[PDB]
Design an enzyme around this catalytic site. Sequence first.
Site, PDB file in Angstrom:
ATOM      1  N   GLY A  17      -2.766  36.536 106.185  1.00  0.00           N
ATOM      2  CA  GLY A  17      -2.665  35.138 105.791  1.00  0.00           C
ATOM      3  C   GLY A  17      -2.282  34.874 104.350  1.00  0.00           C
ATOM      4  N   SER A  22      -4.382  33.382  97.252  1.00  0.00           N
ATOM      5  CA  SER A  22      -4.923  34.645  97.733  1.00  0.00           C
ATOM      6  C   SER A  22      -4.002  35.029  98.892  1.00  0.00           C
ATOM      7  CB  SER A  22      -6.364  34.492  98.229  1.00  0.00           C
ATOM      8  OG  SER A  22      -7.080  33.557  97.442  1.00  0.00           O
ATOM      9  N   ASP A 132     -23.051  27.966 103.532  1.00  0.00           N
ATOM     10  CA  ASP A 132     -21.812  27.441 104.106  1.00  0.00           C
ATOM     11  C   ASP A 132     -21.254  28.385 105.147  1.00  0.00           C
ATOM     12  OD1 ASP A 132     -19.626  25.375 104.036  1.00  0.00           O
ATOM     13  OD2 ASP A 132     -18.431  27.096 103.371  1.00  0.00           O
TER      14      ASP A 132
END
EC number: 2.7.12.1
Length: 260
Positions: A17, A22, A132
């Site tokens: 990805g 990043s 989270d």
Amino acid sequence: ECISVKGRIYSILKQIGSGGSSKVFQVLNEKKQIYAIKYVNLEEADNQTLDSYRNEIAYLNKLQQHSDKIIRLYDYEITDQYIYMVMECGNIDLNSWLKKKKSIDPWERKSYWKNMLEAVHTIHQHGIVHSDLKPANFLIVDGMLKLIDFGIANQMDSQVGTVNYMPPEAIKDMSKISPKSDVWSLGCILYYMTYGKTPFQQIINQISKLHAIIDPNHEIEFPDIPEKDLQDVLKCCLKRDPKQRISIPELLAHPYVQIQ
């Protein structure tokens, strides 16, 4: 083309990805062994941002040794302009795999649940509260869940940040975010593995979803199933009051996780 870390050369098979920017890749070393390499661009990072990455990198390296349900960070090279990280390469992140799966093998769900609690317990031992958690944060590596992230780096392509997993402490507290909060989220993940939706997934108004989440009058349904332990687990994690909520050590001694 191809990347070198530290030494040390790597052919790029694919790109898992763009963060971004990043940028994760499927890579292969000189021995043709598959790893995942995470490039990050520091060119425009500040004090605290940089210092959060260091910190997460720091823990990920240390917490290696305490549990094999943490993603292996094999090696890493970091300068003033970038970061490269050589890492354990998985099969697929949990979130994606669940969207594919129509429904899960009951015994496989128990397996992952153990894998999940284990990893989160570890970080809790070192005084880290992720705060989270989504399925996204777990990677299936050789049929096994591994936590890939500690939610320390809280800074950086639709808008896709769900509040479906948020604990009611977060929302009232506007302190009380603790490990219990992490239990609340983990409950939701199992619940989804259990029932199909997350507890308040049906509500579509984020603002309501919130009011719902924190409202004790609003009662989560727990449709009866074969696995009445699984039900019991589900009931204990989603108790809106943290004190009333169960802890992970207690969850690790639960019949659901221990008895077959």
